[PDB]
Design a protein around this ligand. Structure first.
Ligand SMILES: CCNc1ncnc2c1ncn2[C@@H]1O[C@H](/C=C/CNC(=O)c2cc(-c3ccc(F)cc3)cc(O)c2O)[C@@H](O)[C@H]1O
Ligand SMILES: [Cl-]
Ligand SMILES: [Cl-]
Ligand SMILES: [Mg+2]
Length: 213
């Protein structure tokens, strides 16, 4: 058994099917009382909720689902008919995420794509019928934030006004990404200071809005 499987089982044993908030609470409780895990957490999660409500995106991409905590957060706030695509390379975690979303009742709003972002991003247009993305949440390996931002642009998936939202810009940090977006005329950036999930350690989210080529 893995820690990720243990989180899923705790939600199944302690939350209410079809109630996303109960799922989020259960995961937070497990990760605070039993075993830490790299979910975005409630502190940063409340900032993400405020961003999602401000922008009301019709199509969101998440890079790195993990166990589906942030996918539950985001999908529960989507307007009716809006959609989330979430990419997760680890097949075990992809299945956990699918089951988390099923449990929460959010499965009709989300598509969980099992594969690496560098493989799946170039397929979005033709295979997933994407035109452009309204919002992207970056939460995968930190050294892939910049490569994948640049791939998304190459592939034509960013429009003027696409909102990038990046986790962990302080801890662990993503120094190439952060320097790049902050220094580029192609992005307008805002920093939201917060705390690392389940810890009294400063972290933050970066919002970087694409300005066009
Ligand atoms: C290969 C790049 N493309 C990818 N495409 C799809 N899924 C990918 C990809 N990379 C990684 N994944 C998945 O994203 C997840 C990985 C995320 C990496 N995150 C972190 O390392 C992380 C780490 C911390 C952290 C902070 C403090 C610490 F002391 C220790 C760890 C906190 C966080 O919030 C984090 O997000 C996994 O589910 C992984 O399988
Ligand atoms: Cl998460
Ligand atoms: Cl937290
Ligand atoms: Mg993170």
């Amino acid at each position: 058994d893995t820690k990720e499987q243990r989180i899923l089982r705790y939600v199944q044993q302690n939350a209410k099917p079809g109630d996303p908030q109960s799922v989020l609470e259960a995961i937070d409780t497990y990760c605070t009382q039993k075993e830490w895990a790299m979910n975005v957490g409630d502190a940063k999660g409340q900032i993400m909720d405020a961003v999602i409500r401000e922008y009301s995106p019709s199509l969101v991409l998440e890079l790195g689902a993990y166990c589906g905590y942030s996918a539950v957060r985001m999908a529960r706030l989507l307007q009716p008919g809006a959609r989330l695509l979430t990419m997760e390379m680890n097949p075990d975690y992809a299945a956990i995420t699918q089951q988390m979303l099923n449990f929460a009742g959010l499965q009709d709003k989300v598509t969980i794509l099992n594969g690496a972002s560098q493989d799946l991003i170039p397929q979005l247009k033709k295979k997933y019928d994407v035109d452009t993305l309204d919002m992207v949440f970056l939460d995968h390996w930190k050294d892939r934030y910049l490569p994948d931002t640049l791939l998304l642009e190459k592939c034509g998936l960013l429009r003027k006004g696409t909102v990038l939202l990046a986790d962990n810009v302080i801890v662990p940090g993503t120094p190439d990404f952060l320097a790049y977006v902050r220094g580029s005329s192609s992005f307008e950036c805002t920093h939201y200071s917060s705390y690392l999930e389940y810890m009294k350690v400063v972290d933050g989210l970066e919002k970087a809005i694409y300005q066009g080529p």
